Enzyme design. Structure first.
Site, PDB file in Angstrom:
ATOM      1  N   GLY A  14     -58.299  21.132  32.480  1.00 15.54           N
ATOM      2  CA  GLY A  14     -59.570  20.931  31.779  1.00 15.54           C
ATOM      3  C   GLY A  14     -60.682  20.781  32.775  1.00 15.54           C
ATOM      4  O   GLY A  14     -60.452  20.161  33.824  1.00 15.54           O
ATOM      5  N   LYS A  15     -61.815  21.423  32.513  1.00 19.88           N
ATOM      6  CA  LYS A  15     -63.028  21.294  33.347  1.00 19.88           C
ATOM      7  C   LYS A  15     -64.205  21.248  32.390  1.00 19.88           C
ATOM      8  O   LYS A  15     -64.203  21.996  31.396  1.00 19.88           O
ATOM      9  CB  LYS A  15     -63.118  22.429  34.370  1.00 19.88           C
ATOM     10  N   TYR A  18     -67.932  16.331  32.109  1.00 17.82           N
ATOM     11  CA  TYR A  18     -67.283  15.017  32.419  1.00 17.82           C
ATOM     12  C   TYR A  18     -66.697  15.032  33.844  1.00 17.82           C
ATOM     13  O   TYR A  18     -66.548  13.934  34.440  1.00 17.82           O
ATOM     14  CB  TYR A  18     -66.151  14.634  31.445  1.00 17.82           C
ATOM     15  CG  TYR A  18     -65.023  15.627  31.341  1.00 17.82           C
ATOM     16  CD1 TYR A  18     -63.933  15.595  32.203  1.00 17.82           C
ATOM     17  CD2 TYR A  18     -65.053  16.621  30.380  1.00 17.82           C
ATOM     18  CE1 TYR A  18     -62.902  16.517  32.098  1.00 17.82           C
ATOM     19  CE2 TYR A  18     -64.035  17.550  30.263  1.00 17.82           C
ATOM     20  CZ  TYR A  18     -62.965  17.505  31.135  1.00 17.82           C
ATOM     21  OH  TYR A  18     -61.971  18.418  30.979  1.00 17.82           O
ATOM     22  N   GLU A  20     -63.069  16.890  35.618  1.00 19.12           N
ATOM     23  CA  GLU A  20     -61.860  17.738  35.512  1.00 19.12           C
ATOM     24  C   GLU A  20     -60.667  16.900  35.083  1.00 19.12           C
ATOM     25  O   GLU A  20     -60.599  15.732  35.498  1.00 19.12           O
ATOM     26  CB  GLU A  20     -61.522  18.393  36.850  1.00 19.12           C
ATOM     27  CG  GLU A  20     -62.539  19.433  37.304  1.00 19.12           C
ATOM     28  CD  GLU A  20     -62.410  19.871  38.758  1.00 19.12           C
ATOM     29  OE1 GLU A  20     -61.411  19.545  39.412  1.00 19.12           O
ATOM     30  OE2 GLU A  20     -63.335  20.563  39.232  1.00 19.12           O
ATOM     31  N   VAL A  21     -59.686  17.489  34.399  1.00 19.97           N
ATOM     32  CA  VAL A  21     -58.353  16.849  34.241  1.00 19.97           C
ATOM     33  C   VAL A  21     -57.321  17.756  34.893  1.00 19.97           C
ATOM     34  O   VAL A  21     -57.397  19.007  34.676  1.00 19.97           O
ATOM     35  CB  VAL A  21     -57.997  16.526  32.788  1.00 19.97           C
ATOM     36  CG1 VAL A  21     -56.630  15.866  32.688  1.00 19.97           C
ATOM     37  CG2 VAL A  21     -59.095  15.705  32.158  1.00 19.97           C
ATOM     38  N   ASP A 133     -66.204   8.490  19.972  1.00 23.85           N
ATOM     39  CA  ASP A 133     -66.238   9.949  20.234  1.00 23.85           C
ATOM     40  C   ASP A 133     -64.936  10.575  19.727  1.00 23.85           C
ATOM     41  O   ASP A 133     -64.322  11.385  20.422  1.00 23.85           O
ATOM     42  CB  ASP A 133     -66.552  10.264  21.700  1.00 23.85           C
ATOM     43  CG  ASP A 133     -66.948  11.706  21.950  1.00 23.85           C
ATOM     44  OD1 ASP A 133     -67.302  12.391  20.978  1.00 23.85           O
ATOM     45  OD2 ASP A 133     -66.836  12.118  23.113  1.00 23.85           O
TER      46      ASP A 133
END
Ligand SMILES: COc1cc(-c2cncc(-c3ccc(C4CCN(C)CC4)cc3)c2C)cc(OC)c1OC
Ligand SMILES: COc1cc(-c2cncc(-c3ccc(C4CCN(C)CC4)cc3)c2C)cc(OC)c1OC
Ligand SMILES: COc1cc(-c2cncc(-c3ccc(C4CCN(C)CC4)cc3)c2C)cc(OC)c1OC
Length: 283
Positions: A14-15, A18, A20-21, A133
């Protein structure tokens, strides 16, 4: 003694704005590593402050492992390390999977369970927590068919939320900001939208809807605050319930439940505990 802290970062999953994961490895086990952008440092601080207050442990809450701050030459590096769920987010999963009655109910009841656990004050225990959220990208799918809730960077104990999922009182700025129950009721609104996203992907009589995000038919991608306010507050639109749901007893019951998460009056909305009970009586 030896304190083994090295995490091998293996794959970016994930990018965003926020940060990155990453899928990472620690002592031969998968972990998830969220690396925060400097712009979203306050999300790391808020999640860290919450876990330093209460060490949440619940099968439907993403499992905390660590918060790390590391000094760099000219910056501070902030990581949040959690359990890793290889099936990815509910948003991801619903794009390329349809559901049967059992798998749809198991998903939504697991989310309700995690949410009710956040919301409830326990004496002795935990403070009440509102997420602020909740959305399908902030829910992960586990191999056992249950989900878990992720991202407590906006959470409040007793950045703004994703605009597509904002309740009418947030968009019209009438939310009672000094009443903690206000924040629970904003989460319930968002939950109802997630329930609609999932229900669409449940097959009945050989029919299913395509994956769409809430309000896909009335706002643009990256809708503005005004776009959302006009739909939700001024026109008081709600997501469509297809006719085919009314041939299926499960989807009929889920439609009623969604309706009761989407009242304009926040205090009319169901509680997470009432949602759980209703879901346990469906099928
Ligand atoms: C600092 O940083 C990180 C540390 C670790 C980590 C590695 N080995 C062992 C530990 C450990 C846990 C607990 C105790 C206890 C034992 C009982 N005694 C009475 C009190 C103390 C000791 C040692 C840790 C916490 C992992 C990390 O990442 C996965 C770290 O980086 C975030
Ligand atoms: C951060 O995360 C992980 C940590 C560890 C880990 C490593 N060394 C030591 C420990 C530990 C030992 C013993 C106590 C004591 C505390 C008080 N009393 C005396 C009874 C028990 C606490 C902690 C742990 C938990 C393992 C992990 O996974 C296998 C972790 O998960 C990634
Ligand atoms: C929402 O938020 C957070 C989520 C996570 C998190 C935990 N497990 C697994 C994931 C993940 C793994 C894999 C895929 C892909 C890759 C392989 N395939 C091609 C499709 C599936 C997507 C997602 C994530 C993103 C961690 C977080 O923090 C450390 C989060 O932030 C709080």
């Amino acid at each position: 003694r030896t304190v083994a802290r090295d995490i091998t970062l293996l794959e970016c999953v994930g990018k965003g704005r926020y940060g990155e994961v990453w899928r990472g490895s620690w002592q031969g086990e998968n972990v998830a590593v969220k690396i925060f952008s400097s712009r979203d440092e306050k999300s790391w601080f808020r999640e860290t402050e919450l876990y330093n207050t209460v060490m949440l442990r619940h099968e439907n809450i993403l499992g905390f492992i660590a918060s790390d701050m590391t000094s760099r030459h000219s910056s501070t590096q902030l990581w949040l390390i959690t359990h890793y769920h290889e099936m990815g987010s509910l948003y991801d999963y619903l794009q390329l999977t349809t559901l049967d009655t059992v798998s749809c109910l198991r998903i939504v009841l697991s989310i309700a369970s995690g949410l009710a656990h956040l919301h409830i004050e326990i004496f002795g225990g935990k403070p009440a927590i509102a997420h602020r959220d909740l959305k399908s990208k902030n829910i992960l799918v586990k191999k056992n068919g249950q989900c878990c809730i992720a991202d407590l960077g906006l959470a409040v104990m007793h950045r703004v939320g994703t605009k597509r999922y904002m309740a009418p009182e947030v968009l019209d700025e009438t939310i009672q900001v000094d009443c903690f129950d206000s924040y629970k009721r904003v989460d319930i609104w968002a939950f109802g939208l997630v329930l609609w996203e999932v229900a669409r992907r449940m097959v009945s009589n050989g029919i299913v809807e395509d994956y769409k995000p809430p309000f896909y038919d009335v706002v643009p991608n990256d809708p503005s605050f005004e776009d959302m306010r006009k739909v939700v507050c001024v026109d008081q639109q709600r997501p469509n319930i297809p006719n085919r749901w009314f041939s299926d007893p499960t989807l009929t019951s889920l439609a009623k439940l969604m309706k009761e998460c989407w009242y304009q009056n926040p205090s009319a909305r169901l509680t997470a505990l009432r949602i759980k009970k209703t879901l346990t009586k469906i099928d």
